[PDB]
Design a protein around this ligand. Sequence first.
Ligand SMILES: CC(=O)N[C@@H]1[C@@H](O[C@@H]2O[C@H](CO)[C@H](O)[C@H](O[C@]3(C(=O)O)C[C@H](O)[C@@H](NC(C)=O)[C@H]([C@H](O)[C@H](O)CO)O3)[C@H]2O)[C@H](O)[C@@H](CO)O[C@H]1O
Ligand SMILES: CC(=O)N[C@@H]1[C@@H](O[C@@H]2O[C@H](CO)[C@H](O)[C@H](O[C@]3(C(=O)O)C[C@H](O)[C@@H](NC(C)=O)[C@H]([C@H](O)[C@H](O)CO)O3)[C@H]2O)[C@H](O)[C@@H](CO)O[C@H]1O
Ligand SMILES: CC(=O)N[C@@H]1[C@@H](O[C@@H]2O[C@H](CO)[C@H](O)[C@H](O[C@]3(C(=O)O)C[C@H](O)[C@@H](NC(C)=O)[C@H]([C@H](O)[C@H](O)CO)O3)[C@H]2O)[C@H](O)[C@@H](CO)O[C@H]1O
Ligand SMILES: *[C@@H]1O[C@H](CO)[C@@H](O)[C@H](O)[C@H]1NC(C)=O
Ligand SMILES: *[C@@H]1O[C@H](CO)[C@@H](O)[C@H](O)[C@H]1NC(C)=O
Ligand SMILES: *[C@@H]1O[C@H](CO)[C@@H](O)[C@H](O)[C@H]1NC(C)=O
Ligand SMILES: *[C@@H]1O[C@H](CO)[C@@H](O)[C@H](O)[C@H]1NC(C)=O
Ligand SMILES: *[C@@H]1O[C@H](CO)[C@@H](O)[C@H](O)[C@H]1NC(C)=O
Ligand SMILES: *[C@@H]1O[C@H](CO)[C@@H](O)[C@H](O)[C@H]1NC(C)=O
Lengths: 323, 323, 323, 175, 175, 175
Amino acid sequence: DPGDQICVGYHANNSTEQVDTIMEKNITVTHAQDILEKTHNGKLCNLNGVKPLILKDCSVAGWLLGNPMCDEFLNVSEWSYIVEKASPANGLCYPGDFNDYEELKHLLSRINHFEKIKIIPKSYWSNHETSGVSSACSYLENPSFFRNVVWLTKKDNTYPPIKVNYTNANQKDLLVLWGIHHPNNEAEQKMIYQNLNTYVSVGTSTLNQRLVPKIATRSKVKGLSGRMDFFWTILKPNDTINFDSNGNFIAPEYAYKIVKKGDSAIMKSELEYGNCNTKCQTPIGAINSSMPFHNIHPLTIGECPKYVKSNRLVLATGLRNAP
Amino acid sequence: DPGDQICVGYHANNSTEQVDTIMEKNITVTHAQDILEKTHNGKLCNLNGVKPLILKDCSVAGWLLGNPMCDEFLNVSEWSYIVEKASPANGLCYPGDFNDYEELKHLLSRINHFEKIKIIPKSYWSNHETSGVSSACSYLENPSFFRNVVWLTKKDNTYPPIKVNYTNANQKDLLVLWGIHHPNNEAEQKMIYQNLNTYVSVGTSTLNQRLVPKIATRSKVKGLSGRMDFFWTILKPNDTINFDSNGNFIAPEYAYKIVKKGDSAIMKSELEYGNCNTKCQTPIGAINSSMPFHNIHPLTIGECPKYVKSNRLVLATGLRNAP
Amino acid sequence: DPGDQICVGYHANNSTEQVDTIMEKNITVTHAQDILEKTHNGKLCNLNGVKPLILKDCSVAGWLLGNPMCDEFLNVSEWSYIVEKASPANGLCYPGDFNDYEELKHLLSRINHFEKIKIIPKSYWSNHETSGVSSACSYLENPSFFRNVVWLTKKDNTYPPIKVNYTNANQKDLLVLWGIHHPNNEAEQKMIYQNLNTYVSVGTSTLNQRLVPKIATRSKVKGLSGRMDFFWTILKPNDTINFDSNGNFIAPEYAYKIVKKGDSAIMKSELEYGNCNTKCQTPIGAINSSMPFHNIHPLTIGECPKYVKSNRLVLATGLRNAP
Amino acid sequence: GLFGAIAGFIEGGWQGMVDGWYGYHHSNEQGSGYAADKESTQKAIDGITNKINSIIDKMNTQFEAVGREFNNLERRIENLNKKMEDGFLDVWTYNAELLVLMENERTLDFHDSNVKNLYEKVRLQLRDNAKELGNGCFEFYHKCDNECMESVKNGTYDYPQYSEEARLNREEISG
Amino acid sequence: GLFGAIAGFIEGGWQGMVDGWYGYHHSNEQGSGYAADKESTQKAIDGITNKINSIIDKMNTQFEAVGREFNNLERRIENLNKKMEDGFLDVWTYNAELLVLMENERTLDFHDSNVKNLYEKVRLQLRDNAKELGNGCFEFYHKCDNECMESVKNGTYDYPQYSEEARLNREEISG
Amino acid sequence: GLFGAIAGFIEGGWQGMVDGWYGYHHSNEQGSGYAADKESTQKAIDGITNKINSIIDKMNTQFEAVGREFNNLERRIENLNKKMEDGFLDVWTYNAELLVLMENERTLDFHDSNVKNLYEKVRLQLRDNAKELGNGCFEFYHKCDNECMESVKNGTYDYPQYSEEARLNREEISG
Ligand SMILES: CC(=O)N[C@@H]1[C@@H](O[C@@H]2O[C@H](CO)[C@H](O)[C@H](O[C@]3(C(=O)O)C[C@H](O)[C@@H](NC(C)=O)[C@H]([C@H](O)[C@H](O)CO)O3)[C@H]2O)[C@H](O)[C@@H](CO)O[C@H]1O
Ligand SMILES: CC(=O)N[C@@H]1[C@@H](O[C@@H]2O[C@H](CO)[C@H](O)[C@H](O[C@]3(C(=O)O)C[C@H](O)[C@@H](NC(C)=O)[C@H]([C@H](O)[C@H](O)CO)O3)[C@H]2O)[C@H](O)[C@@H](CO)O[C@H]1O
Ligand SMILES: CC(=O)N[C@@H]1[C@@H](O[C@@H]2O[C@H](CO)[C@H](O)[C@H](O[C@]3(C(=O)O)C[C@H](O)[C@@H](NC(C)=O)[C@H]([C@H](O)[C@H](O)CO)O3)[C@H]2O)[C@H](O)[C@@H](CO)O[C@H]1O
Ligand SMILES: *[C@@H]1O[C@H](CO)[C@@H](O)[C@H](O)[C@H]1NC(C)=O
Ligand SMILES: *[C@@H]1O[C@H](CO)[C@@H](O)[C@H](O)[C@H]1NC(C)=O
Ligand SMILES: *[C@@H]1O[C@H](CO)[C@@H](O)[C@H](O)[C@H]1NC(C)=O
Ligand SMILES: *[C@@H]1O[C@H](CO)[C@@H](O)[C@H](O)[C@H]1NC(C)=O
Ligand SMILES: *[C@@H]1O[C@H](CO)[C@@H](O)[C@H](O)[C@H]1NC(C)=O
Ligand SMILES: *[C@@H]1O[C@H](CO)[C@@H](O)[C@H](O)[C@H]1NC(C)=O
């Protein structure tokens, strides 16, 4: 005859959750914890207290040199990170090359605080014209130039030798930019600079540069065949930058004071501002998440989950849930 | 008294196969699957439909410029991958330097289809001799030159200033090559070029180059002390390359049209052609295999197993096979 | 009534040793093997039979060129590894740039045996003064120069054109060093070199260099505004180096014969010599250990444990030790 | 099942038990009910919970990619940079997918072990004072009231106190 | 052995069984023979097979090396390039050798578990209607014909149908 | 415990046993004493020892960092170099910490398995010639002298030689 019983058994519920195993997939389980974050707001947000520099259709070169199509940015001074398009349209309006550009962009990705200062006022050029201007560097269909650098030309019919210095009074590093113009022929050279064999020399404690115009025939870019090559350096505190020139000099009017260095980044993205906040940003959107992982995009900034290429990461917690 | 029995037991066979464990090695097992591929045909085979460029004793420079010891290659146009020896013997027959060579070799490893075209015919040089030739660039013991570039020299006793352009009519990128000659002394300079202070300038929309001969005393290489430095650029579609020179110009006769870019490679190998086909090639031979791994050589091309340095990878499938 | 018993049980002891598990930490265990090495002698020791080059307050440049503040090192010839401070103070006493310095430091980290040889004796300069000297390159507060290179200046009031060669008789590679001086103005140029438009040209079988002084205004460094730029090359066996100059030449007196190449290193450390031996050295001390791992510093030299960032790595061997 | 309990001899699991992961279902003259062993269930929560956190912590340091720009003649180092950064992404993706796959297996078999260990904790308590049915149930040879059972559950089960009664009913089914 | 079955209490394995991995050897009055449990053998094939494919799939993305040229004054980045490419080769070689070593262990103990689980599937069916000899064999207290046994194999074994007969022969060896 | 033996049914371990990892404690009319099973203990030493060496050998090739200098305008490749070298340090640190954490678990459960396997080696030898108490002890139904026990330890235990004596004392506690 039947007696009292005790049994041993285990938990079950109405749970659809599956996890994976090396030996078996799609195991219906009791409880499971998903550890992969697979959603983003799709927006370029502020990073903590601070807003990004969104360059829109300008490039770093366009912004720093002052392409007239980029006047929006003449007075930025503090950001969290920089956003720049894949192929911005407004960089060097006057066709040329920017020397050590990537090294400068990299240097820039360690900086979050500029203060643009006036290093050599146009008032200085008492024996040179400062009105150098081009149709490629044109604003409202009316020939203009880079806002931060000045195209010196002959005054009357002379170009007296230039010798100007600037000392870094401040206690911050200083980013100075200059340039040289490469004319098309000896004629054009004489028309702008009078002098026929020219140089631009820049000297600091570390720099020792001698530039010389290169007259050659080139294809037309923005209708021009001339060229303009730009260069940069970091002027340390209590050091002096020394320009000497007898022509073709594109002089610095503004320099940038480096007030705060921080961890930053230049992101390639086609998105606009998002007017929103985050603790973790990617080029395709921001992340609000506690997950230990995410799979949205490798290039992140801020305190983020770890990126993996997985489309699914879920840990079993409970036990096999029998039907 | 004895009764009916049932037993539980497990499979065994006459199997020698061993597998390994963290805690015990050389475990004799029942069944095992080897997953490492350890054999290759030892041959440089075609890759799918397509045959490799085997440069033999020429180098990429030797081939592209047309070292006379490399005429075999004057009309290659389609390959799967390139094979070049460790130390080819026929590169720059006239001693010199090839500017940004590795960047060009790299660029070349993304190309599988050339079409060599005639960009500036010798007929053009109506006021210059095109017969420049050397004993270092010698063919059948009789002084010759690079097949694809032309050594311009003075005609009669003048060297009129050169100004020639070429526009990229086509819809493919174009690889143009040129050079400059560095003579030994002012005398030799005058004997070849008449003119005493010379330049070569090349201009595109992106390029802005000015080259100037360097007269100096150098050690003898192939009996010569003179030198010849070569340079390249990619001429995009609908853009014009512009040469200006008054001496020392090594002019392009042929340019290379870049018809197809594909995933490719330049392999270092001492082997010849193999006259065979494969889906996976290495520098020491090809692979016909389904194994998930191989250990033959890291540098592979095509759909291949994953390379590991292991000499043995075998999975246990069956159970411990008791003696 | 009670009968004979047998029991099954397991080992226990008075053991405090703990190990860790994914599912539980601080498991008190019976036996355990620590596999992480966490102590170093804190000393820069010899490496096997051989002692390091400890440059103290000199830099590689300072040593090789012969900064007078570094005479200690004028005759080193054999080391195991090199130690150099983060910011040595005695490098280029005369302000300038060392061309391809990091590539030379790297080349040096493959060398453990120099033999300094006299390549061009001062006796050679029969028509030039060799007494060029500066207050920046000053020894006992009395203006001196680099010990291994010679500052040629005008003798009487002329500087005859220089043309000197050296052939590598030996069967070892040879490291030759030279330089050029960049004066402040045309006046100073004439005072030192007489000649007004100058060049230094160096030629080997591979090298083809033309250097030209750069007169420009620069900030003061060690009270000087002039500069001196140095350059190096490897002269292979049975090849000749060829200098031509008409001024500003800083000539090689000594070259370095490369007798033995070995695996070596340049370590950044602030420590002095240790007068001790080891088989494994790090920048912060040496290791005497059998452990398969260590966590002291990533940059090691010699037969060493594998570096990990772990502060603890211990394997359980025995079983859970119940209280 | 690796240990034979879950979907093994204990075929199927109890929708009825809810307060825990592993537990008992009694059935006596006073009545029935499910009760979960909180000793073994809590030890399985402290286990899995620690596991998760440890998987997360081992991953808290791992390779973070950063944008770097190269020009038209730095293709080689650009490509080096690209392969390097994919290399680590592929490496850490492998480590995470594999660690999860592996610890998942170890998790399920852990539950399996925990159940069979709990069944054995009972079997070894009762011995011949009860019968094992082969389904994870014990039929008592004696009388277990809603107070005797709490002893076997708490482990505090006095064997000789029922031994004699039990013996006589077990031998009854014979002579 | 981790589970105690293979080269444990079931000492030695059967050269005779062939149609499967785990199975039975019967011995009654009608005769003998080996028969493999296809339920448990097929579940072990679906297991190992899935394992292999998963090891392969986790490896289907991993670092591929590419040739890159450097000149005489790019020794630093050449060496960087070299260390980087060895780094991944050493990394993936470690991952493959270790994954194999680990899953090998898990494979053998799986077979071990599968056998002990199969032995237990029988033991719990028979209970006291048979005797366990300690070698992986059960001696029946009743009569098992070549049709009764197929019931214990298929799991469809009617316990009470033999219970009574069995009881009388088990108690026979006593009084 | 994963296998249920160590800190399971065999609650607590013996400070008294010393010559080995797993073993027996006998108690008969001639006297007591601990003795360690050297068969199973030596197999556990050969196991763990091989494990250590294999962990070391798999690690004998792995990424070694080297110092490289960059100038003020090689920040990009300097940073590339830095991330690359941290990448491998973080990778190998993960592999070592995880391999240890994992094999530690496998080690403890191995000891656990080894003990339960040893207990079962005895249980299956004795069968009904003794009683299992549920604490890892067997009470003999017959007489085991300091020479009979060495048979069960060595595995050389003649069951029928004691079977008859044993049967009569087991049935005694009944009628
Ligand atoms: C190569 C040539 O001769 N082209 C002729 C055209 O000349 C150029 O054409 C562009 C428009 O396509 C401009 O008019 C150029 O004029 C400027 C400019 O760039 O806008 C006018 C500037 O004020 C002048 N600035 C300074 C500071 O000198 C600038 C510079 O001289 C040059 O940029 C220096 O290289 O040039 C003009 O140069 C011409 O417009 C056309 C019809 O007249 O005929 C073309 O053959
Ligand atoms: C340095 C010097 O004067 N050496 C003398 C030898 O002159 C050189 O020797 C080589 C053989 O070793 C050749 O004969 C050279 O002649 C050529 C050449 O390279 O083959 C002849 C070419 O036709 C000529 N081509 C052109 C287009 O000018 C070529 C060039 O001039 C040079 O390559 C430019 O650098 O030179 C010859 O230059 C000389 O052979 C030997 C005995 O006469 O005496 C040596 O001292
Ligand atoms: C820029 C200028 O004119 N400065 C004046 C000072 O001249 C320089 O000052 C330094 C000390 O700060 C030295 O006296 C320099 O003199 C030397 C030197 O470097 O020591 C003297 C060397 O014998 C001489 N050597 C050679 C081989 O020529 C060396 C070189 O000429 C230069 O280094 C080349 O650039 O110069 C001196 O040049 C001057 O001391 C001070 C007061 O007289 O006034 C300053 O305006
Ligand atoms: C596992 O489940 C997913 C989601 O339902 C499904 O897409 C996939 O095909 C399943 N895998 C297998 C092997 O059936
Ligand atoms: C800057 O230039 C002025 C004259 O233009 C000169 O007197 C002064 O010394 C220079 N400053 C420095 C630091 O060289
Ligand atoms: C394992 O087997 C191989 C091949 O027979 C042999 O070379 C090796 O020595 C064996 N390993 C050991 C530890 O005996
Ligand atoms: C090419 O050169 C010819 C004359 O040599 C010139 O007329 C023509 O404009 C040039 N083409 C271009 C695109 O500059
Ligand atoms: C493990 O032990 C260490 C050393 O005693 C201690 O610092 C740590 O807090 C312990 N961990 C936990 C989780 O208690
Ligand atoms: C070295 O120079 C001497 C004259 O200064 C010259 O005669 C000799 O040929 C040169 N050596 C070489 C190898 O050029």
